[PDB]
Design a protein that fits this description.
The protein has no helices and 23 strands. With 343 residues, the chain is mainly beta. The PDB classes it as cell adhesion.
Length: 343
């Protein structure tokens, strides 16, 4: 006997089913505060039957339906974001006819469609069927996070401002998956010239597969800033480059008789274009949840490839560093540029 709350035909809310997959491509985006606003929108084909309290089953007046939403999740980082998992938060908008996509929570939003849905349930109710979700990283995670089926919002309806039932007319069930990507980048400000300097041609004579007489070995420290790589993963350096034809352990210097070698300081040569030749780096320790600094030194020097007296000239060559995980090739991270002078 007065305008009041709406209910479904059964009394139990109608459940709308939603889901998404978010794949975060940039490793470094996996950071506290990262936000994907209004990234997923649902536009569902499901509908339900409903009826409201009214002063009689066929009242003289009509009234529009007013809608309220409430989050069914715990509070997140502000009044419109709510915790969905240990690491993720969500914010929602729900469509109300003749209003728009209204930010949850909201109250007393009118459909501006006066009616008399007061007697037997009527068909065609859709509130809940359309909405939009925003995702927020509260804490970064490694790998993937699966959001199991969870009710995230309750929709209530009424014919009387501020008078709502404790039982919603509809709810929104969400599931989904968020993934992150492993990555490493060479530290900024790292120069990649390796200048072997000058040698007399006679320094290489008769020294096949070895460095020259009076060799000045070059040492270089490499630091990679890696993200989303858990302990237990081995992280290697590998070289992409043209091997010397006579001595393939060496990188081409555009001369048949001399070449460039990179090794680990212990005589283990990192051979170019050889998928079995890998230099295991120190993977460091996680910090800021998902970051780690991965380091190695390399030792470089020219070698005689043939034992023959090389011609005087200015020689150069290149080798592109890759970082590989176990392999997964994270891609080219910088090109070493070799120079050698033979007088």
């Amino acid at each position: 006997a007065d305008w009041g709350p709406c209910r479904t035909a059964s009394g139990d809310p109608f459940i709308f089913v939603t889901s998404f997959t978010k794949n975060i491509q940039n490793p470094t985006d996996n950071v506290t505060g990262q936000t994907y606003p209004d990234f997923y929108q649902w536009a569902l084909g499901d509908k339900y039957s409903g009826v409201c309290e009214c002063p009689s089953p066929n009242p003289t007046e009509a009234r529009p339906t007013l809608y309220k939403t409430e989050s069914t999740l715990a509070a997140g980082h502000n009044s419109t974001y709510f915790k969905i998992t240990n690491n993720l938060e969500v914010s929602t908008r729900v469509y109300i006819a003749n209003v728009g996509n209204v930010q949850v929570p909201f109250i007393n939003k009118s459909n501006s469609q006066p009616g008399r849905e007061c007697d037997q349930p009527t068909f065609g109710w859709t509130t809940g069927s359309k909405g939009q979700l925003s995702l927020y990283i509260a804490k970064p995670f490694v790998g993937e996070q699966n959001i199991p089926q969870t009710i995230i919002v309750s929709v209530f309806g009424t014919k009387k401002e501020n008078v709502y039932s404790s039982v919603p007319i509809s709810q929104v069930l969400l599931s989904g998956k968020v993934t992150v990507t492993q990555g490493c980048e060479l530290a900024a400000g790292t120069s990649l010239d390796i200048d072997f300097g000058e040698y007399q041609a006679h320094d290489f004579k008769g020294r096949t597969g070895q460095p020259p007489q009076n060799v000045q070995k070059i040492q270089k420290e490499l630091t990679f800033n890696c993200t989303n790589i858990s302990d237990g993963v081995h992280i290697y350096l590998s070289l992409e480059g043209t091997p010397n034809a006579a001595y393939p352990s060496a990188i081409s210097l555009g001369n048949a008789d001399v070449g460039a070698v990179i090794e680990d300081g212990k005589g283990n040569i990192l051979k170019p274009n050889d998928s079995n030749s890998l230099l295991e780096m120190n993977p460091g320790s996680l910090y800021e949840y998902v970051k780690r600094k991965v380091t190695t030194t390399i030792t470089a020097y020219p070698v005689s490839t043939t034992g023959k007296l090389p011609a005087a000239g200015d020689y150069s060559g290149v080798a592109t560093m890759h970082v590989e995980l176990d392999t997964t090739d994270l891609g080219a991270k910088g090109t070493l540029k070799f120079s050698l002078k033979i007088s």
